[PDB]
Structure formats: structure tokens, C-alpha cells
Structure 1
Amino acid sequence: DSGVTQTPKHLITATGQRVTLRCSPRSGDLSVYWYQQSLDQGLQFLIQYYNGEERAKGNILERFSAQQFPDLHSELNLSSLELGDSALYFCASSVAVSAGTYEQYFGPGTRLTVTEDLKNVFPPEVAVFEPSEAEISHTQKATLVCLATGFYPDHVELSWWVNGKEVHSGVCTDPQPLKEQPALNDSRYALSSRLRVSATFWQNPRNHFRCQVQFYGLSENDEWTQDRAKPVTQIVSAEAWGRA
């Protein structure tokens, strides 16, 4: 792993809220860096703190605070949140002040979603579609599909679990999730993923297939009032046994 740790993985708020992203650096480092990245931005530098003191200035808009604490771990505040503030936030760490000789290391990053209304957040519907009988008659292979549907935002991590074990081979998922109403500002998204298995493997009932979707949704610290169930951070899943 990247050494650098970051909290939290998910984060969603209404416009103009105040959130603080904590970053514990690589245990052995004295530089911490903050980078913001949106699709229409790429990897932009924000600020760097050496041994507790401020080093490199960047484009931390007035709204942003950044502190390295005495224990060398950093907080980064992003006040009065605009919709444009929706980006992927990366912490980083290094041994000395300059990263010339001794290099940088990034954590996994925070995904901040700033939305107009938390009513926009939706769990993903999930459905595994069993392969066509034709694919077998033609390719002597079988392709399962998993549709993950109607989620906002697109914090979604899909995974396939055959016979209880997790499979990385025979697996394929769309990098970008498909918008449902492309025209709507806060459209819900939809993701598709395929697991191809051999013909015989599908033709076996002893084999069980699971498409499982991680959804980084609403906090247990967020206020909720809808009659509909709270769209919290949760796993939605589809199972499927082999048909002879």
C-alpha cells in the first residue's frame, strides 16, 4: 500500500457546507502535500507543509485551510462548498522539503461530492443477467452481465464472487459509469460489468455467481427525513446459480 492514509474515502455534502479532510502521512516523512483533481482540472497542486511549517503555496482558494499538526498529520478544510469543488482530493508525503532527491507518495484519496440537495443521493439497483443460450451454441462460452443501476453519485466499486471466492480473471467493467438523463445536472448513473466463464462452468449448478457493488452513500451523521429508506453507504448484491 501507498503508506499514506486518508480519511474519509467517501464524502458528500450540500452546497456551502464545511468539511475537513484528514491525512496521516507516511510514518517517516515530514512533508505533506495536497492536490485537487477534477475531470476538467487534472492533477492540480494546492499546498505543502514541511515539518509543521508552510512551504509551497498553490491554488488553495481562500475557502481552503491547510494545517500540518505537530504529529506530522495534516487537515485540509474546504469551506463554503461550491458545486465546482466536487473533485478527487489527494494527500501526499515526502522525506525532505524538496521532492528532488527523495520522492512523493500519494494516499488513495478523498472523493468530495458537493450536491444541491442530499435528496440527490441514491443507492444502486443491481441485477445480474444470466448468459444467452446462444453464446453457448456459438462460442461454447458464457457471459454473465451485471447491471448496477440508478445511483448518485458514482461512488461505486463492483466485484465478482464465484463459489464464495473473489474473481479478478474473466472480469470486465466500464471505467466510466453511464449517465441516465445526460441532460440533468444531477443525473443518476448506471454501471455494467461482465464475467465470462467457460460453457461447462455455467452448465454446473454447483457454481454460484455474485455481483456485488459497494456504494459510498450518505453518512450515519447526515440528517434524513424522507419516507423512502436512507441512501447510506452500503453494499447491494445479486446472486446467480448455474443453469444446466
Structure 2
Amino acid sequence: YELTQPLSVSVSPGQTAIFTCSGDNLGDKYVCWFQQRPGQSPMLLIYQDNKRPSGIPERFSGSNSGNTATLTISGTQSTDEADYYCQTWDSTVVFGGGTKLTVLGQPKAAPSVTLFPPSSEELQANKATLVCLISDFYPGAVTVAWKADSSPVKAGVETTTPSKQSNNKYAASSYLSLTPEQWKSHRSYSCQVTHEGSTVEKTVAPTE
């Protein structure tokens, strides 16, 4: 037995998001819905088709009949962004594949970039890491390049994919691993962050 859910649903802010979940004679079964925000455990939203546990506001509602169950969120907020799973029991437990909710119509936001040089403790351990932390950007996509003085660096770079922060903008980080001698050898290093076609660059230089 399988439950089918769309990969993703999107909504504009403050408006009504509708999730579908289909299966053969699903209406003969009881359906539950779960919400899972990024980096958190799933949490029950709806059980037995349309009942809400105490911590779930009334703007979430469920329905189930024929071959389709629905979850409706009215007044949808950015903080409702999450994966939503439907689930039932058919001789065994069955979960839908999950639907990712995106709240669109958000204003664009340029990345904030903070670049840290290697700590003195790390240098004394004979290592050197530059840390480029990138936050508060929207939409959630950036590319990151590094420079030693004015030259492109390829080796030693590791960069994360962006992930949602709590205020609903995105964050990413990038790291450049160097030897202490490489760090001290150049006049500067720069982390260059490109977001929606334009670039912010931060620079640091060996001190003390």
C-alpha cells in the first residue's frame, strides 16, 4: 500500500496552504499528519483524519474521504515552513513521502559575511583555518570563492549548502585550510560571496 504526496507545496504569506495525500480507499482508514521543521523531530498535527492535539492551533485542519486526505493551513507563516508527512495503517504503518512547504513572496536580503582569521591557539597547534560565516540572505543560494592576495584558491576549500535560520533567512559557511606558513606568506586572504548576481567580499590579513 502506498500514500502519494506531492514533493512540494508553496503559498504566499498569510494565505491558505493545502496538502494532498492520496491512496486507494484512503477514506476507509484514519489518517495522521506530522510536521517536521528543519533539524527537529516530527510532531503530530492531526490524528484520526481531523482531530487536533492541544498544542496545535485551529488554523491547521484535516479532512479524509474517498481516495484523498488533505491538510489545510490557513494564515500560513514563514515559521510553518517544514516537511509535512501523512500516515495511515493498512496491515502495517505507511508514511507518505513528505511534502516540503515553501512560503514565497519574501523580500530579497543580501548576505551578511563575517570572516575570521586562524586563532593563535590553532596556529600554535601548527594548523590554520579561515572561517567565512554567511547569514541572513534570501533567497537561499550563494556561491563562495576564495582569494590569496588577488589569486583564486581552489585547494583547501570546503563549503556547506545553505540552511534555514530561525528568522527565516538562510545561512552557509565556508572554510579554507592552510598551513601556518601559507597564512603568514600572503598579504591577505578574501572570502567572496556571490548572491543573486552580485558579490560581497571580506578580507583578513596576518597580524601581531
User: Which structure has the bigger radius of gyration?
Assistant: 2
TM-score (normalised: structure 2): 0.49
TM-score (normalised: structure 1): 0.44
